[model samples]
Target: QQDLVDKTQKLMKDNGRNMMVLGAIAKGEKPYDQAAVDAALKQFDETAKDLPKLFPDSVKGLKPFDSKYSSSPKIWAERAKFDTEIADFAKAVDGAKGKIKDVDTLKAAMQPIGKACGNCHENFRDKEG
Candidate 1:
């Protein structure tokens, strides 16, 4: 169960890092390199596809693995909705794939993906201070 928690945290942290990479490029803080965009999107997409699997019933209501662990019990209580949120995230990522050729496009694509993440976190994750 601890392994599952650890895996979940790593996946989420990696996704957050990759999102920042893409965000910088989109905001023009970093130059728009197609390779970087592709790499970041690939990681984000893979995380979106794989994240739901990390929330098996065995880990439900488990203690926080670390201070950053924020998955709420609501995830299992409302598993169907959680799964739908993950699906929406994957769809948002899919919509951005092969479409981030420039900063403008990347900025536009990030909106839906960000919204999906915010929506899921608001509903299924505990607030972290």
Candidate 2:
């Protein structure tokens, strides 16, 4: 259980960092570099593909390992919806890949990706967990 939690935490942290990088570029806070964008998108792709496996039934309802370990029990209650959100995130990532060659395109692509993240978090993640 601890191993699974750790894996999930790492994946979330890495992907969160990736999104921050992409967000900075999108907002013009950071210069747009194709290599940097690609690197961030690559991590997003991997996270979108692998994240669902980290939230198995066995991990549901476990006590929080730390303040950041907030896998809500609602995840198991609405498993299908949670899974669909993951799929939507993957789809959003797929849609953006190879097309975000510039900041403008990256900005446009971020809409769906951000929405997917929010949709899942709104329903499955505890704000105070």
Candidate 3:
């Protein structure tokens, strides 16, 4: 579990920085790099794909919190919802991979992907955990 958490955090940091670069491009500050973006998005997709397996068992009383901040009971209480969130995140990453021909399209594609990450974190992530 601990190793899984560490790996997940690393993936998050990597993907998060890659998305921030997308934001920079969206702001017209960074040049678009198709191969670069594609590579990062591919990794993001893989990370998302791996999440469900890494996530804790959603059984009641099986809280998977492992740090100062803990997993919310809501995660176990509404297991399918959490699964749906991961699925949606992966879907967004997959879509973004195909939409990256140019800057405007990349920005448009990244919007929902970014939103998916932020929304899930707001709901399921605890800062210290």
Candidate 4:
């Protein structure tokens, strides 16, 4: 159980940072490498798809600050929906495909991915107490 918790936390953190990297590339703050972006998106999809299955119905985790540690009921109830949302971001990226040849399209694709992360956090994360 504890091992699963730790694995879940690590996945979320790794994906979170990768999302931010995508955001930076979108904003023209970082250089865009199509191959790198594709690889990252694949990793995101792989981890996001695994997350719901990795979670128990709920967990009373020790580290409240950890995103995957939250015991929010909304998370458990909506885990399936959340998983779809995460996959949607990856699909959107896949749709963009060669369309992300420029910063404009890149920003368009990445913004929604960031929003998927933000939306889940806003709805399911408990305040640290």
**Best model number under TM-score:** 1
Best of the two (1, 2) by TM-score: 1
Which window of 10 residues has the lowest lDDT sum in candidate 2?
59-68
Candidate 4 displacement at residue 95 in angstroms: 1.9
- In model 1, the runs with Cα more than 4 Å from the true position are 62-68
Displacement of residue 29 (Cα, Å) in model 4 is: 3.2
Spell out the clash pairs found in candidate 1.
none
Model 3 lDDT per residue over 10-92, tens place: 66667767766666677887577777778777777787777656555532234544443344667665568887887787888
Better of 1 and 4 by TM-score: 1
- Please give the distance, in angstroms, between residue 35's alpha carbon in candidate 3 and its true position after superposition: 1.4
Q: Which candidate has the top score in lDDT?
A: 1
Residue-wise C-alpha lDDT for candidate 1, range 22-43, written one tens digit per residue: 7777566866776776777777
User: What is the overall TM-score of model 4 with all chains considered together?
Assistant: 0.72
Question: TM-score of every model?
Answer: 0.83, 0.82, 0.75, 0.72
Local error of candidate 1 at residue 58 (angstroms): 4.7
For residue 68, model 4's alpha carbon misses the true position, in angstroms, by 8.6
lDDT of 2 by residue, 36-120 (tens): 7677776776787888778766666544445466678887777788778887777777777866778888878878877767777
lDDT, candidate 4, equals: 0.66
User: Per-residue alpha-carbon lDDT of model 4 for 61-117, expressed as tens digits?
Assistant: 444334535546666568777677776866665665645566676676666665666
Worst 10 residues of 3 by lDDT: 58-67
- Report the poorest 10 consecutive residues by lDDT, candidate 4: 57-66
- Pairs clashing in candidate 3? none
- Listed per candidate, the RMSD to the true structure in angstroms reads 2.3, 2.3, 3.4, 3.6
